[PDB]
Design a protein around this ligand. Structure first.
Ligand code: HEM
Ligand code: HEM
Lengths: 106, 106
């Protein structure tokens, strides 16, 4: 299981613009081995906003299948480019090593 | 829903020791409002290992309850510094803004 994150440093007060763009049903959710997408807003950021798009996958090849897909090319078409309010963008890949679920579900 | 993340930069090759410490049943899974814990290993880190412990909570109050509990005290009795392979420690808090679950492609 892997998580792929795209973390955007955004000019203060503009985070909500990037969140609104992901706040809708899309195509990545239909891909094989997709397990979930979440959008996070970092707390306590002083001079900027930080918005994280996180996607979780059975395996890296499932993510790679999506980035080759047509729907990825359709969802990376009319973006209006990278918005001006985006100061910095980091991408990271994580291996999930331990998962500990609640007792209320056990 | 919120996420609290502790990110440890570790001496390259020693990340498995921290992962191992969390690879067991603990007491945080028993806390009210706890929704899950996972441990991540960042890919393609050059000089070091990076291990992230992420915990998910229904509300900030639930996490606060946990940090005020005798279980958190006892787990953080410490009274002696961290292992020498732990180089740095960063804590972050996130608000979950959007959740998109897998969907049938039809
Ligand atoms: C490298 C610079 C990148 C920029 C500037 C960028 C920006 C954007 C923007 C503004 C959208 C809105 C269009 C839409 O959501 O339909 C979008 C689509 C999307 N991007 Fe990126 N992105 C980048 C790379 C990435 C990466 C690394 C991921 C990894 C998860 C990713 C995942 C997505 C997803 C899931 C969507 C939505 C597709 C859907 O709705 O099905 N993107 N991108
Ligand atoms: C800032 C300095 C910190 C140090 C030196 C530290 C150190 C430790 C150590 C050595 C353990 C081992 C106890 C065990 O394996 O159960 C532990 C437990 C743990 N710590 Fe930290 N910690 C720190 C902060 C935090 C914070 C702020 C969080 C917030 C989420 C956190 C999350 C956890 C979790 C989830 C556990 C395991 C709880 C369980 O197994 O029931 N740590 N801590």
């Amino acid at each position: 299981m892997i998580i792929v994150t795209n973390t955007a440093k955004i000019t203060k007060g503009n985070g909500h613009k990037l969140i609104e763009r992901f706040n809708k049903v899309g195509k990545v959710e239909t891909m094989p081995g997709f397990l979930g997408l979440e959008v996070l807003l970092t707390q306590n950021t002083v001079d900027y906003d930080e918005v994280t798009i996180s996607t979780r996958w059975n395996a890296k090849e499932d993510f790679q299948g999506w980035t080759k897909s047509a729907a990825f090319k359709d969802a990376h078409s009319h973006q209006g480019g990278m918005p001006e309010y985006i100061l910095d963008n980091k991408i990271a890949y994580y291996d999930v090593k331990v998962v500990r679920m609640p007792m209320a579900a056990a």
